[PDB]
Design a protein around this ligand. Structure first.
Ligand SMILES: Nc1ncnc2c1ncn2[C@@H]1O[C@H](COP(=O)(O)OP(=O)(O)OP(=O)(O)O)[C@@H](O)[C@H]1O
Ligand SMILES: Nc1ncnc2c1ncn2[C@@H]1O[C@H](COP(=O)(O)OP(=O)(O)OP(=O)(O)O)[C@@H](O)[C@H]1O
Ligand SMILES: [Mg+2]
Ligand SMILES: [Mg+2]
Lengths: 55, 205, 288, 694
């Protein structure tokens, strides 16, 4: 019975607010030139796990 | 005794999943990893083999018989195509994602790789079904006369195989997200045969 | 001979030789071997085999029902510099004809296999074996296409055929392939008068058949037939391994013979094998 | 079979005078100076008697009737003159076949060369015709000597009505007939003097003699591609020597040869047999003999359907309304095949059924560098009911039946039994190293193999219902169709190999209309551009082809390669049938439009910009592609800002250079025809492919 699985809960309360880059598409003509990665259904900033793994 | 009980759960993605798709020709400014979608419904699915192999290995990490008779075995004479027939999931809330404004049901995530010692990035555009997509899951446990009081041992395994898959990813590039998933509205009707429902629907939660 | 058995399939897999090719339909072997496996998962096996050996038992191959019932192309009936050659590349991907058009087809009308499914393939793997990278082909029906094994209606048959719809039909079951739902419907009379079993004048078989040895000579010199390949393995629960079958060749559906015949259920038991592995090859016909 | 020897050579040599005539031009008749030149070699009488008195002995009336059934001062006219086009001559440069030289693309500036350079032709004729034994052992080595040399010289070449067919094929197709006239007259059972049926009366045309047989090696596609990867080349070449051994053993069971043949390319093969009471049941017997051979080995993955058409000599001409029934000559044998492709495998081949080479063919894969192929017996790689097939080295003379030599016609054309199969030269590298060889010396280019699968569109249409636009008693001869079928077979089975000179690829089956090439991606497209541009010169472009290229990585399976480009030329068979399709189901450009408006118009000017500037790069290219993929009406204006903003950023010694780029880029972006936009969407892909560093 030596199979377990545990979770480190944390709270990423940051400072110097972060820019995890997202869609590097051809932006609008005077708008944001580099947006961040976002949840689709809420348009809120996310921190993806892949940006947490390689970093 | 002959019956066929059917699960009808609702797969909810707390983190948007990727199921790889198939090797096709990607152009320059195109998505490098498109998700597998049925050709007719240009909507995401979760293939039943993808649910099977993840549930097969997660229960193999616990129940190591009990596992072979639920998933089949080409060896082990009586355990060929054992007792479960899975099904490809489909979007249930395709009408309920829009009105929470979503213009296309699959988001495109941009990633890269920082090659070590040269520091030159290597970008990547992988396509993922968005979070509050809800997929319909149907697991079918078939009852014959060759069970003999094993229709409750085989539900502390399936309902525990769901619970293991709750806290593990479901398909694609896990350990980077992409699988925080939830099974919702568990119930087990008997669509064909004669068998009770209360002794296993009350086993839930 | 009795009522149609419309089946809404939704992502099935009917392989033919390999795993890399589904074929959008299934022979009568696929539906007869399914029912025997259902009747063995139940207790009612020998109740079906007495009905299977019975004279009145009928099956046919699967043909695409979307609005009305469709029929296979009658093989060998076409009875002007480039289109007569251009349409030969188009009336060779033409195989499934509407029942309201077969009488128009033998006198001349163009058709194109009004599309029923997207016969694609998906790539799959097993992650910790280093050599399992396989591909399963897939037929995926166009949201209203059904197949209708035409069969003689019975209480045992509806008991087993409604067990297939929650147990799948075809290949890669227990992975989400072949699971359907039934709609038993009355046969229209403009199809029902042409159904025969002992007719004698210019008939078309619409199932994979194999005649008796005296009759098999009779179907050769006048028949515009097409062969098949009934290889594969034998699905058993009393073997501990898997053996090949005996690999007979049947006459595919659409084999327009000059007259009807009588076919058997070919026993393809492997050498030193416990039970009997059968193969349905009883014919069922269609006038013109 | 003694008189069949002497009747055959003199049929080939009844117009050997006109190559000895027009080289060192005399004044007298050509039929006499043929045998005058011929009597100095071996002094044979009966062959020379066929040459002396065939234009005015019960042997030369067969030649006189068969010279009419061939077709009934000026250089050789082009076979693509009589079509749906009425302004071209394109007379052939009269040189010989070389196999290591460029094709003599026939231009209209070759009318005067009708006397001069024929002496270079007749010099080579003395080499092989002198030491010649005239048996049936060297029976095809003379057929080399006409197709390699007598090809591009004309026949009668006077102010006649034919004016178009060659002298090599006119020698073959007459000698194809004359043996079939012999077997029709012998199996009928009367030999009492030819003049009585041929010259005294002309009613020989009004009976169905010398029928047209054919076969079809079916299952030829699904056998090959359903299989570290060059083993497929030997598998596609094994079915060519099988496709010839069927065509040769059918002529061994008769008294005929490669003259009695019109086509063998890739499974299909046409013939001219003799409509006897004998040849119709030796076809049924050989079909029954060969199909049971395919069951014991290939288990109905392959099948050969011998169909035959009993046509008449009247239905081959141009005077009457026989072109309206000339398709029926091929159709009667084609209806029999299409009926025999349905009703296959008769009773006791199936009742007996209802109750290796997989390893052996691996040994043949290492025999592909050899060039001499032997018909041995019960040794290895069976190809017929008692024979086998091995690729032996120069150490030959080990129990041979046929010595199937390579594509030479010139180098190995000094030995005995010169039997020729023209297949697949320039297998440069192994298949798993065409991706890694896409980087140049500078080290830039993307590591991907790419595979061409093309075919010529209406080839069977233009073969049968071609030459059919000029009158009701129109030209439409079998000779005008045999030379057409020779011209395409001499294009694909020979000229493709020099188009693959050093183009870093491996041709697999340059056969009928099909070409299946696979190589490095840069030179697989340079091959295709130098494939049809050479072909439209060759065909006076009126009869086109369509290619499908698929770019794959290394170690993808060939069954995934050859299908995903096999169903990618099907998107090019549906555009207008004259179209390339690149890498995907879109990018299906018209082929003539692909070269003059993508590959040389735009891709040069995209190459000319970024290799003659400094400050732009792949970032500028990538944002042009992204604005080319979407194309809203908003992206027209949004691109007008993006290009004008970059004039402001350049260093003013490049601003007018960039201004000639953006006034030319924005020109093809904003249109209504939607044509030049996806062209430049593609032209940026092939430029950004070829500049990618590792
Ligand atoms: N030796 C060969 N290697 C590779 N390809 C070949 C060879 N011989 C023929 N082919 C090509 O394979 C193609 C496909 O032929 P297929 O297997 O369909 O037989 P078929 O006679 O065309 O059958 P059907 O007439 O029913 O279409 C042919 O068009 C031919 O160009
Ligand atoms: N060497 C040859 N001589 C005469 N005819 C040939 C030759 N090679 C090929 N053909 C004709 O080309 C046909 C090849 O068929 P294929 O299906 O590849 O294309 P197609 O029938 O020409 O038309 P499409 O390209 O539109 O399919 C053969 O059926 C044959 O009739
Ligand atoms: Mg072709
Ligand atoms: Mg073609």
């Amino acid at each position: 019975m030596t199979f377990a699985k545990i979770k480190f809960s944390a709270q990423i309360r940051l400072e110097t607010g972060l820019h995890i880059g997202g869609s590097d598409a051809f932006a609008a003509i005077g708008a944001i030139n580099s947006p961040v990665i976002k949840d689709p259904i809420t348009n809120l900033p996310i921190i993806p796990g892949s940006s947490l793994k390689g970093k | 005794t002959f019956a066929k009980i059917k699960f009808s759960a609702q797969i909810r993605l707390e983190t948007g999943l990727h199921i790889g798709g198939s090797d096709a020709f990607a152009a320059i400014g195109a998505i490098n990893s498109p998700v597998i979608k049925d050709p007719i419904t240009n909507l995401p699915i979760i293939p039943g083999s993808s649910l099977k192999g993840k549930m097969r290995t997660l229960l193999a990490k616990v129940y190591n018989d009990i596992l072979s008779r639920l998933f089949g075995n080409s060896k082990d004479k009586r355990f060929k195509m054992g007792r479960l027939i899975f099904r490809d999931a489909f979007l249930s809330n395709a009408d309920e994602l829009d009105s929470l404004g979503v213009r296309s049901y699959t988001e495109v995530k941009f990633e890269n790789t920082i090659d070590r010692i040269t520091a030159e990035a290597n970008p990547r555009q992988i396509e993922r079904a968005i979070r509050n997509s809800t997929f319909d899951f149907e697991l079918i446990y078939e009852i014959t006369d060759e069970n003999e009081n094993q229709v409750e041992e085989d539900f502390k395994v399936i309902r525990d195989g769901l619970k293991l898959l709750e806290l593990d990813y479901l398909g694609g590039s896990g350990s980077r997200g992409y699988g925080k998933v939830a099974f919702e509205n568990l119930k087990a009707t008997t669509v064909f045969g004669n068998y009770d429902v209360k002794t296993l629907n009350e086993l839930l939660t | 001979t009795y009522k149609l058995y419309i089946m809404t399939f939704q992502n099935a897999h009917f392989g033919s030789g390999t795993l890399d090719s589904s074929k959008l339909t299934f022979s009568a072997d696929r539906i007869f071997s399914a029912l025997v496996l259902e009747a063995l998962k139940m207790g009612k096996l020998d109740a079906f085999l007495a009905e299977a050996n019975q004279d009145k038992f009928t099956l046919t191959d699967a043909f695409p029902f979307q609005f009305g019932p469709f029929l296979p192309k009658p093989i060998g009936y076409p009875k002007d510099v480039k289109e007569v050659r251009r349409q030969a590349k188009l009336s060779k991907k033409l195989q499934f004809l509407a029942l309201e058009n077969v009488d128009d087809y033998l006198n001349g009308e163009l058709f194109e296999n009004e599309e029923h499914a997207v016969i694609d393939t998906v790539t799959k793997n097993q992650p910790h074996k280093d050599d399992n990278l396989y591909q399963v082909a897939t037929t995926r029906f166009s949201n209203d296409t059904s197949l209708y094994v035409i069969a003689n209606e019975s209480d045992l048959l509806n008991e087993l055929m409604s067990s297939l719809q929650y147990s799948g039909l075809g290949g890669k079951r227990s992975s989400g392939f072949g699971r359907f739902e039934l709609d038993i419907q009355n046969i229209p009379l403009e199809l029902s008068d042409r159904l025969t079993k002992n007719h004698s004048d210019k008939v078309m078989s619409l199932t994979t058949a194999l005649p008796v040895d005296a009759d098999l000579e009779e179907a050769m010199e006048d028949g515009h037939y097409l062969l098949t390949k009934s290889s594969g393995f034998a699905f058993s629960h009393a073997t501990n391994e898997n053996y090949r079958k005996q690999d007979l060749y049947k006459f595919a559906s659409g084999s327009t013979f000059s007259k009807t015949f009588e076919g058997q259920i070919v026993d393809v038991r492997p050498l030193d094998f416990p039970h009997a592995v059968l193969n349905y090859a009883k014919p069922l016909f269609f006038k013109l | 079979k003694k008189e069949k020897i002497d009747l055959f050579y003199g049929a080939l040599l009844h117009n050997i005078g006109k190559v000895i005539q027009r080289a060192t031009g005399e004044r007298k008749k050509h039929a006499l100076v043929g045998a005058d030149w011929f009597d100095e070699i071996a002094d044979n009488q009966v062959i020379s008697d066929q040459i002396r008195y065939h234009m005015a002995d019960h042997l030369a009336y067969i030649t006189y009737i068969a010279d009419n059934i061939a077709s009934g001062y000026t250089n050789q006219a082009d076979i693509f003159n009589v079509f749906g086009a009425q302004t071209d001559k394109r007379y052939f440069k009269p040189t010989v076949l070389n196999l290591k030289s460029k094709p003599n693309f026939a231009s209209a500036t070759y009318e005067p060369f009708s006397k001069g350079d024929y002496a270079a032709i007749a010099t080579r004729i003395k080499n092989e015709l002198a030491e010649f034994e005239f048996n049936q052992v060297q029976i095809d080595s003379l057929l080399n000597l006409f197709e390699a040399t007598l090809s591009f010289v004309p026949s009668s070449t006077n102010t006649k009505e034919i004016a178009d067919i060659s002298l090599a094929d006119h020698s073959r197709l007459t000698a194809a007939f004359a043996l079939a006239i012999y077997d029709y007259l012998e199996d009928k059972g009367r030999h009492n003097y030819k003049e009585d049926l041929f010259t005294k009366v002309s009613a020989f045309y009004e009976e169905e003699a010398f029928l047209l047989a054919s076969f079809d090696l079916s299952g030829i596609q699904d056998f090959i591609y359903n299989i570290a990867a060059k083993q497929l080349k030997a598998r596609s070449l094994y079915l060519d020597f099988m496709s010839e051994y069927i065509a040769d053993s059918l002529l061994d069971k008769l008294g005929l040869n490669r003259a009695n043949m019109l086509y063998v390319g890739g499974g299909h093969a046409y013939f001219v047999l003799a409509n006897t009471e004998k040849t119709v049941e030796t076809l049924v017997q050989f079909e029954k003999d060969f199909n049971q051979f395919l069951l014991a080995n290939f288990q109905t993955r392959l099948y050969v359907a011998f169909g035959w058409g009993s046509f008449a000599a009247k239905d081959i001409m141009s005077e009457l309304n026989s072109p309206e029934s000339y398709r029926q000559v091929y159709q009667k044998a084609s209806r029999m095949i299409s009926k025999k492709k349905i009703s296959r495998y008769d009773y006791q081949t199936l009742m007996l059924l209802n109750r290796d080479i997989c390893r052996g063919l691996y040994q043949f894969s290492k025999e592909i560098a050899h060039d001499h192929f032997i018909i041995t017996e019960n040794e290895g790689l069976p190809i017929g009911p008692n024979a086998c097939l091995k690729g032996v080295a120069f150490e030959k003379l080990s129990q041979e039946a046929f010595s199937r030599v390579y594509v030479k016609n010139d180098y190995k054309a000094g030995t005995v039994k010169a039997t020729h199969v023209f297949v697949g030269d320039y297998q440069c590298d192994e298949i798993y190293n065409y991706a890694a060889l896409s980087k140049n010396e500078n080290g830039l280019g993307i590591k991907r193999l790419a595979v061409v699968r093309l075919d010529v569109d209406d080839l069977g249409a233009a073969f049968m219902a071609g030459f059919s636009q000029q009158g009701n008693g129109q030209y439409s001869t079998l000779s005008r169709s045999a030379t057409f079928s020779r011209s395409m077979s001499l294009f694909f089975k020979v000229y493709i190999n020099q188009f693959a000179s050093d183009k870093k690829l491996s041709i697999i089956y340059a056969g009928g209309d099909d070409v299946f090439a696979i190589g490095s991606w840069q030179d697989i497209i340079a091959f295709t551009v130098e494939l049809r541009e050479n072909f439209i010169k060759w065909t006076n472009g009126k009869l086109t082809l369509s290619a499908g290229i698929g770019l794959f990585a290394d170690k993808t399976p060939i069954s995934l390669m050859a299908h995903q480009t096999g169903e990618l030329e099907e998107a090019a068979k549906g555009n207008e049938k004259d179209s390339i399709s690149l890498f995907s189901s879109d990018y299906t450009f018209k082929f003539d439009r692909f070269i003059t408006n993508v590959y040389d118009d735009k891709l040069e000017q995209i190459r000319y910009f970024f290799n003659h500037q400094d400050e732009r790069g792949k970032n500028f290219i990538y944002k042009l592609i992204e604005l080319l993929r979407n194309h809203d009406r908003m992206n027209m204006a949004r691109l007008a800002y993006y290009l004008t903003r970059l004039e402001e950023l350049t260093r003013e010694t490049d601003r007018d250079k960039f201004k000639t780029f953006k006034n030319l880029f924005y020109s093809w972006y904003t249109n209504k025809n939607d044509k030049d936009r996806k062209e430049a969407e593609l032209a940026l892909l092939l430029y950004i492919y070829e500049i990618r560093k590792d």
